[PDB]
Write an enzyme that holds these catalytic residues in place. Structure first.
Site, mmCIF file in Angstrom:
data_model
loop_
_atom_site.group_PDB
_atom_site.id
_atom_site.type_symbol
_atom_site.label_atom_id
_atom_site.label_comp_id
_atom_site.label_asym_id
_atom_site.label_seq_id
_atom_site.Cartn_x
_atom_site.Cartn_y
_atom_site.Cartn_z
ATOM 1 N N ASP A 154 -5.176 9.965 13.396
ATOM 2 C CA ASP A 154 -5.626 9.645 12.039
ATOM 3 C C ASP A 154 -6.108 8.196 11.899
ATOM 4 O OD1 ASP A 154 -6.220 10.133 9.360
ATOM 5 O OD2 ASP A 154 -4.257 9.589 8.630
ATOM 6 N N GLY A 173 0.794 -1.206 0.000
ATOM 7 C CA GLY A 173 0.000 0.000 0.000
ATOM 8 C C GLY A 173 0.829 1.258 0.000
HETATM 9 N N1 LIG Z 1 -4.782 -4.046 1.912
HETATM 10 S S1 LIG Z 1 -4.606 -5.496 2.566
HETATM 11 O O1 LIG Z 1 -5.800 -5.833 3.279
HETATM 12 O O2 LIG Z 1 -4.376 -6.472 1.532
HETATM 13 C C1 LIG Z 1 -3.401 -5.500 3.627
HETATM 14 C C2 LIG Z 1 -3.096 -4.353 4.350
HETATM 15 C C3 LIG Z 1 -2.062 -4.358 5.289
HETATM 16 C C4 LIG Z 1 -1.302 -5.507 5.499
HETATM 17 N N2 LIG Z 1 -0.300 -5.583 6.484
HETATM 18 C C5 LIG Z 1 0.323 -4.614 7.214
HETATM 19 N N3 LIG Z 1 1.193 -5.022 8.163
HETATM 20 C C6 LIG Z 1 1.890 -4.157 8.912
HETATM 21 C C7 LIG Z 1 1.742 -2.792 8.712
HETATM 22 C C8 LIG Z 1 0.851 -2.372 7.737
HETATM 23 C C9 LIG Z 1 0.656 -0.911 7.485
HETATM 24 C C10 LIG Z 1 0.830 0.094 8.370
HETATM 25 N N4 LIG Z 1 0.580 1.208 7.801
HETATM 26 C C11 LIG Z 1 0.221 0.919 6.479
HETATM 27 C C12 LIG Z 1 -0.140 1.777 5.455
HETATM 28 C C13 LIG Z 1 -0.435 1.165 4.237
HETATM 29 C C14 LIG Z 1 -0.374 -0.224 4.064
HETATM 30 C C15 LIG Z 1 0.002 -1.011 5.148
HETATM 31 N N5 LIG Z 1 0.280 -0.385 6.299
HETATM 32 N N6 LIG Z 1 0.169 -3.288 7.000
HETATM 33 C C16 LIG Z 1 -1.641 -6.669 4.796
HETATM 34 C C17 LIG Z 1 -2.671 -6.666 3.857
#
Ligand SMILES: NS(=O)(=O)c1ccc(Nc2nccc(-c3cnc4ccccn34)n2)cc1
EC number: 2.7.11.22
Length: 273
Positions: free
Chosen positions: A113, A9
């Protein structure tokens, strides 16, 4: 020292990637006075807070290494859109998040946030807050507290309770509570639902930096219309999470004692990874 697996992301503070510690751990790698402040959060460890494993400062570049979770609450809500998240799971998630907020707030750290995207879930029924304490170190306005929108410079832990109340409502109804696409549209959406705030319900509101006497005066709507089919316990709790006055707004600690949580459990979610 890391092999990136994929782009997971993009955040307000830079892009996040799934990565393997080359020398086997799977982590979330985020590429961003600050260093010391962030180093403080390394000690902020709790079961419902996404662990900050390491802070790497190399070449004017900053990397935050977090524990990796497999899904965020936004993706899970979209996936559960047809039948909705079962109520006991909503309650479990709300309960856990309030525990995490209660912990951070007791350490004088706020998130500022909160949004579904930084609420992370695992197969075991846990949910965790990501990006805690980072703020103090298009952007969504949907979960923004009214005091921030009205120009309060020195907001409190109450801002997080507001955001979580908004998310709670969204889980229940499968629709964002206040989906503003601008600062004034966000504020006026809040006013249209909860009534335009005045000196009665919020002492000091009319002297806030961005308050205007010209704001339209809308009547408050009943919560039975705003979040069906939340039961009376849930409606009561939500109303306390959405009080205009931050000083009247329920704290995380007090929220945990609310009757809504008398029958709380920890269900296992249906997670498709
Ligand atoms: N979009 S998703 O459902 O496929 C998905 C989203 C997040 C994860 N993991 C994960 N782990 C540790 C930290 C984070 C994290 C912390 N800040 C953000 C900002 C953007 C994206 C991820 N993160 N994210 C797995 C999958």
């Amino acid at each position: 020292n890391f092999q990136k697996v994929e782009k997971i992301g993009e955040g307000t503070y830079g892009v996040v990637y799934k990565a393997r510690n080359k020398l086997g751990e799977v982590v979330a790698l985020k590429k961003i006075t600050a260093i010391r402040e962030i180093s403080l959060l390394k000690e902020l460890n709790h079961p419902n807070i996404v662990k900050l494993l390491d802070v790497i400062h190399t070449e004017n570049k900053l990397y935050l290494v977090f524990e990796f979770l497999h899904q965020d609450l936004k993706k899970f809500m979209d996936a559960s859109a047809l039948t909705g998240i079962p109520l006991p799971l909503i309650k479990s998630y709300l309960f856990q998040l309030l525990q995490g907020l209660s912990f951070c707030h007791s350490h004088r750290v706020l998130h500022r946030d909160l949004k579904p995207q930084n609420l992370l879930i695992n197969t075991e029924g846990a949910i965790k807050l990501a990006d805690f304490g980072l703020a103090r170190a298009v952007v969504t306005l949907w979960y923004r507290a009214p005091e921030i929108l009205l120009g309060c410079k020195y907001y409190s832990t109450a801002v997080d309770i507001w955001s979580l109340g908004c998310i709670f409502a969204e889980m229940v109804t499968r629709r964002a509570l206040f989906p503003g696409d601008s600062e004034i549209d966000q504020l006026f959406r809040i006013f249209r639902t909860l009534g335009t705030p005045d000196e009665v319900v919020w002492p000091g509101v009319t002297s806030m930096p961005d308050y205007k006497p010209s704001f339209p005066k809308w009547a408050r709507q009943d919560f039975s219309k705003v979040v069906p089919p939340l039961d009376e316990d849930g409606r009561s709790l939500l109303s306390q999470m959405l009080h205009y006055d931050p000083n009247k707004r329920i704290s995380a600690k007090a929220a945990l004692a609310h009757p809504f949580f008398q029958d709380v459990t920890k269900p296992v979610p249906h997670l498709r990874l």
